[PDB]
Amino acid sequence: FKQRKSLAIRQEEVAGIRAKFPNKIPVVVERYPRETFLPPLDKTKFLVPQELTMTQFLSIIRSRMVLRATEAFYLLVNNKSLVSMSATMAEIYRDYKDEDGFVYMTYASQETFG
Amino acid sequence: SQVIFNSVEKFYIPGGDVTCHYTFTQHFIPRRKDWIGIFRVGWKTTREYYTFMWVTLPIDQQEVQFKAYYLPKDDEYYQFCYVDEDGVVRGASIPFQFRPENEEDILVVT
């Protein structure tokens, strides 16, 4: 959501989040904009434990779907990056974290990159 | 000084009624046109109150309730101030915002 909020506002949100939950990783999760199949979330910002795997985090994301979908799908960091689902949130944060202090993920059932 | 606010939250959920808790100090004498009002922090005068309640009566550790409709909509800082019949502020609370502490799009994972 870089388009809705300014860099400084996002940095401030991260500051506040980190002040209340200094041990969590703040994660902005977004439905792939061209997704026609999977339902939207009731949540946007997910505060996750360092040790949580990408797989467990995918199951959480699934649990926040406003309709029930059991179907398999993809979790794309930055919407550009296919990553190991055995990876912990600490590693994703170390390697993929945004300049604003957020890690971004897009969930999609299918995607074609150029 | 003479009036003191207790159990003041840093955060008050929008749409909920706000219970304001206050206690008079040993030598303070409350009067019946005394009132408690909610002020933007940085209020210049007591005539700048956003909303108000008369000091609750009858008087025998006090509270007054503010209905949700009349509470500030914005993200600004506010505080309670006690104003007596002479226009003198006798006490002022820590500041607060009318807003969830955690925005609702946030999900904490344990």
Author numbering:
A (entry chain B): 13 to 126
B (entry chain A): 21 to 80, 88 to 137
Lines quoted from the article behind this entry:
Autophagy receptors target cargo to autophagy by binding ATG8 on autophagosomal membranes. NDP52 comprises an N-terminal SKICH domain of unknown structure (aa 1–127), a central coiled-coil forming region (aa 140–420) and a C-terminal ubiquitin-binding Zn finger domain (ZnF, aa 421–446). We determined the crystal structure of the NDP52 N terminus (aa 21–141) containing the SKICH domain and CLIR in isolation and in complex with LC3C.
The NDP52 CLIR was disordered in crystals of apo-NDP52 but became structured in the 2.5 Å complex structure of NDP52 bound to LC3C. Similar to other LC3-LIR complexes (Noda et al., 2010) and to SUMO-SIM interactions (Hecker et al., 2006), the CLIR forms a short β strand that fits into the canonical, hydrophobic LIR binding groove of LC3C. Ile133 of the NDP52 CLIR β strand is at the Trp340-equivalent position but due to its shorter side chain does not occupy the aromatic pocket and is therefore largely solvent exposed. And in contrast to canonical LIR β strands where the first and fourth residue mediate binding, the CLIR-LC3C interaction is dependent on three consecutive hydrophobic residues, the Leu-Val-Val motif, which occupy position two, three, and four of the CLIR β strand. In addition, Val135 on the opposite face of the β strand exploits another hydrophobic wall of the LC3C binding pocket, formed by Phe33. However, it also improves shape complementarity with the hydrophobic CLIR pocket, and enables additional interstrand hydrogen bonds between the CLIR of NDP52 and the β2-strand of LC3C. While the LIR of p62 forms three backbone hydrogen bonds with the β2-strand of LC3B, five bonds are formed between the CLIR and LC3C, which may partly compensate for the missing aromatic-pocket interactions.
